[PDB]
Design a binder for this molecule. Structure first.
Ligand SMILES: Nc1ncnc2c1ncn2[C@@H]1O[C@H](CSCC[C@H](N)C(=O)O)[C@@H](O)[C@H]1O
Ligand SMILES: Nc1ncnc2c1ncn2[C@@H]1O[C@H](CSCC[C@H](N)C(=O)O)[C@@H](O)[C@H]1O
Ligand SMILES: [Zn+2]
Ligand SMILES: [Zn+2]
Lengths: 150, 19, 6, 178, 176, 148, 17
């Protein structure tokens, strides 16, 4: 059952721009930040990109490597991967942290699966958004950091 | 880089997997 | 490889 | 036998679950009927709207075997339907004001009464609330629980005997009695 | 400023620091808002933050004399809307009304008190669920929350709502 | 529908939104359906002072001697509900040879109650009437022409 | 009150003045 996920999703799609902004990360490179106060259990932004097959993702990764283009892929399911390297949405910029304030979840609609980034606690304005990548040295800078993203 | 409002399905080319 | 949920 | 969505008496473009109690719509209005029909007595069943995105709609209710499957319920004189949009009631493609609309999460109830002699009526329920008599003195014949969907919405049907909102104000038999 | 009352509340209810979030405790118990209305059209929102299994809520409006150690809708002084099955309650009488609501749902609460034709209307995610009660008892009505076991809801008195109604006029509770 | 007890408790909280008083086409004032009433629904209670028969006989003669209209309903063979002074709107429900309501005594522990229930579906605006020598003016087809 | 009242008879309830 979808519960309130449909309403939450549509509502989020109309105002995700008011929730986030792009800025240089204290962790690494660019990151996504809270543009305003965000309450617990709030759908913040959708991870958007091009849906590719597994072997395509394997080819693309080696191609995205050898040009030093980092990881902008999010696994949708066992057969498909969302590639946001060349095209997609700003959610690609959300960094990894050992102390995450967001969570990445799959919502199954009829028209397809959606990767949704939701808050796991109240997030104040100016805070950098971050979740657990669940995959390399880690630099999230949090107290009691796991030192590694693996 | 191009922005997307929604997910799109990748249209693979014939030589997508070739080296 | 890729960011995941599980 | 088991009262389910029909195996063959259905539009091919409709996607029916393996339980045959859940159906997903596909483009223009198309219909699926249940496996069992009623000709005498008062009967009841429920439908749950699992998912109904914007620009999708449903017309639910009763239909005779001769109801066109490649058309919305209530298209011909062989069916009576209740539309999600605006709660309009349809019969012979004529939409009349009936109730307010229903949508995702709503559990709709469907009462038919075909009394013999010593008048017939069709009544819809929305989340347990009686929406009033929709059609009275309907055509005589066998009536089947029927579902017509516009685009990719999803509904689940319950023939009973355990309903989420069992009618109190009216006596009935569950469609699962067939 | 309009908040959850710090004394007009069942003591076992856990109220947040900003007094906009309440967590329930065992049997049904109620908290009212600090401000009430006697005349005019008013509106407020409640978001169900967390609703674990076997937990429930009954939300709506309550007069001052409404029993704090009972579910909203228990007596004549309140009208409520139950999370389970979307039942409406008044004087401990449950009637069918709408579908249920749960975690993540944003509920709206409208009341209209003419000077003389009154009515109470509930909203689910911006959708009018219909007039629940009409010609209610004359009196002062307070936004009211009753919770069964450990579920968590948050109230918003305005002026900015997530789903501001588009089919009728109102004033946010925050104006009081 | 449920136990008569719970139906009664429900009805007592909303009977006001079931009925209204108006001039009857039958006689004097009457009670009408404010809304739509499904069949077999408790509409309103006939309230009043429960008295024994011989008390009712004395009270009736007393009322008539003071030119005050008597309103009484017989529960059982030994008791009457006197609604002349402590009555409710149900006291104004007229008789009809074609009734849409029935009056039933409901034997409950805290006392008998006279409940007026719908014998059929009743549409808003209809006059409420149940089946109780003066001529009968209920206006129904094949009226029994006589009362009392 | 909107409820039945049970009449309490007197010892001399049925007597003539
Ligand atoms: N906690 C962390 N420590 C070190 N590098 C991180 C990190 N979280 C994310 N990254 C880096 O960021 C990439 C994820 S995409 C995240 C946005 C990125 N910082 C950018 O500016 O484009 C990964 O390839 C990883 O190298
Ligand atoms: N069907 C009927 N035809 C003629 N008189 C009737 C009647 N039903 C009730 N009445 C009159 O109404 C009395 C019952 S009390 C009913 C209310 C009454 N109409 C009033 O305004 O007071 C009876 O004594 C009888 O005189
Ligand atoms: Zn770290
Ligand atoms: Zn007559």
């Amino acid at each position: 059952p979808l519960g309130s996920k449909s309403s939450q999703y549509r509502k989020m799609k109309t105002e995700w721009k008011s929730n986030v902004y792009l800025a240089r990360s204290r962790i690494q490179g660019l990151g996504l930040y809270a543009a305003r106060d965000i309450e617990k259990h709030t759908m913040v932004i959708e991870y958007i990109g091009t849906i590719i097959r597994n072997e395509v993702a394997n080819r693309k990764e080696k191609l995205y490597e050898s040009q030093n283009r980092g990881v902008y892929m999010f696994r949708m399911d066992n057969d498909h991967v969302i590639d946001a390297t060349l095209t997609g949405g700003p959610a690609r910029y959300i960094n990894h942290s050992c102390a995450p304030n967001c969570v990445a979840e799959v919502v199954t609609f009829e028209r397809g699966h959606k990767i949704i980034i939701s808050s796991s606690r109240r997030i104040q304005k100016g805070e950098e958004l971050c979740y657990d990548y669940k995959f390399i040295p880690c630099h999230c800078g949090a107290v009691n950091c796991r030192k590694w993203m693996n | 880089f191009k922005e997307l409002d929604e997910n799109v399905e990748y249209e693979e080319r014939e030589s997508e997997f070739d080296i | 490889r890729t960011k995941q949920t599980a | 036998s088991r009262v389910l969505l029909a195996l063959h008496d259905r539009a091919p473009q409709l996607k029916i679950s393996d339980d045959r109690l859940t159906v997903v719509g596909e483009k223009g209005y198309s219909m699926v009927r249940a496996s069992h029909g009623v000709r005498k007595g008062a009967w009841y069943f429920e439908i749950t709207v699992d998912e109904m995105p914007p620009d999708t709609a449903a017309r639910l209710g009763w239909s005779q075997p001769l109801g066109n499957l490649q058309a919305p319920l209530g298209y011909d004189k062989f069916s009576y339907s209740w539309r999600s949009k605006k709660g309009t009631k349809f019969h012979q493609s004529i939409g009349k004001h009936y109730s307010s609309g229903y949508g995702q999460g709503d559990v709709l109830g469907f009462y038919i009464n075909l009394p013999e002699d010593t008048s017939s009526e069709i009544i819809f329920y929305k989340n347990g609330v009686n929406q009033g008599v929709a059609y009275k003195d309907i055509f005589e014949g066998v009536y089947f629980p029927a579902i017509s969907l516009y685009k990719s919405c999803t509904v689940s049907i319950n023939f009973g005997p355990c309903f989420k909102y069992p009618p109190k104000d009216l006596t009935y038999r569950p469609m699962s009695d067939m």
